[PDB]
Each structure stands twice: as structure tokens, then as C-alpha cells.
Amino acid sequence: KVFERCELARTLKRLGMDGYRGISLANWMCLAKWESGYNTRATNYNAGDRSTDFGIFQINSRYWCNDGKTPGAVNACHLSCSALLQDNIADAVACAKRVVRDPQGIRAWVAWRNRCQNRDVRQYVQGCGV
Ligand SMILES: [Cl-]
Ligand SMILES: [Cl-]
Ligand code: NA
């Protein structure tokens, strides 16, 4: 599923993402925008280390979900990576919450540092009623 901007904003708020571990909703929106373009079925194989990024938040198989083919991988979200390719983003949000519960927080995603950190991210939630 490819979410429309405001549709996703309202959905994440309902799932309790606004202010989770100090992270505002607009930051989550900025992250989803740059990671997958709000696309739940986006997949990206990282040839360099044999891992794959899955779904709307592009969560990595080396630490967060199990796809069975990633060398030396753990499954912290205790989910099959398939769960992060569904149209319903409930499991993906629960896993994103687990990621930021680690010391790095939102910084775990390099794309956030490049495109969201220290930026005016208000544009991502403007006019959405959230
Ligand atoms: Cl699962
Ligand atoms: Cl599994
Ligand atoms: Na894994």
C-alpha cells in the first residue's frame, strides 16, 4: 500500500507515535517519506552485507526481523520480516517503537540524519488535522 501523506499522519497518531520516546509525529513522517515514500511493500537488498530493509520504515533484517537468509542476524522485534510488508502497519509501528527504545533513538536510521535532522519538518504534517 502507498499511503497518502495525511492519511498516514492520522494513522501514526492513532497508533501512538506522536512523541514516542521524545520523537514527534513530523519526524516519523519525515523518516517514512525518505525511507520508502510511504510504501509498505518496499524492499531493499543491501548487497554489501547480505541484509534487506523491509517496508514503510525500511527496517533491517540483521537486527530487527527474521528473514532466515541474513548471516549473524537477530530478531529483536520477534517478527518474520514478512510482517513488515503488510498493508496494515500495526506490526511495523510496534517494531519501529522497539528500534528507538535503544540508545540511538531515531538516529538509528541514517536517512533521518541526512534528510530530517535539524530541518523544518513541519511540512510533513501540515493540514492533516493531527
Ligand atoms: Cl510474524
Ligand atoms: Cl520468523
Ligand atoms: Na534478523
Curated annotation (Swiss-Prot):
Keywords: Amyloid, Amyloidosis, Antimicrobial, Bacteriolytic enzyme, Disease variant, Disulfide bond, Glycosidase, Hydrolase, Secreted, Signal. Its main location: secreted. The keyword Amino-acid biosynthesis does not apply. GO terms for molecular function: identical protein binding; lysozyme activity. Its EC number is 3.2.1.17. The active site is at 35, 53. Gene3D superfamilies: 1.10.530.10. It catalyses: Hydrolysis of (1->4)-beta-linkages between N-acetylmuramic acid and N-acetyl-D-glucosamine residues in a peptidoglycan and between N-acetyl-D-glucosamine residues in chitodextrins. GO terms for cellular component: azurophil granule lumen; extracellular exosome; extracellular region; extracellular space; specific granule lumen; tertiary granule lumen. Disulfide bonds join 6-128, 30-116, 65-81, 77-95. It comes from the Eukaryota. One of its GO terms (biological process) is defense response to bacterium. It is found in: Secreted. The keyword Hydrolase applies. Residues 1-130 form the C-type lysozyme domain. InterPro entries: Glyco_hydro_22, Glyco_hydro_22_CS, Glyco_hydro_22_lys, Lysozyme-like_dom_sf. Lysozymes have primarily a bacteriolytic function; those in tissues and body fluids are associated with the monocyte-macrophage system and enhance the activity of immunoagents. Lysozyme C is capable of both hydrolysis and transglycosylation; it also shows a slight esterase activity. It acts rapidly on both peptide-substituted and unsubstituted peptidoglycan, and slowly on chitin oligosaccharides. Belongs to the glycosyl hydrolase 22 family. It is linked to Amyloidosis, hereditary systemic 5: A form of hereditary systemic amyloidosis, a disorder characterized by amyloid deposition in multiple tissues resulting in a wide clinical spectrum. AMYLD5 primarily affects the viscera, and the predominant clinical features are renal dysfunction of varying severity, and intra-abdominal bleeding. Inheritance is autosomal dominant. Monomer. This is Lysozyme C. It comes from Homo sapiens. The gene is LYZ.
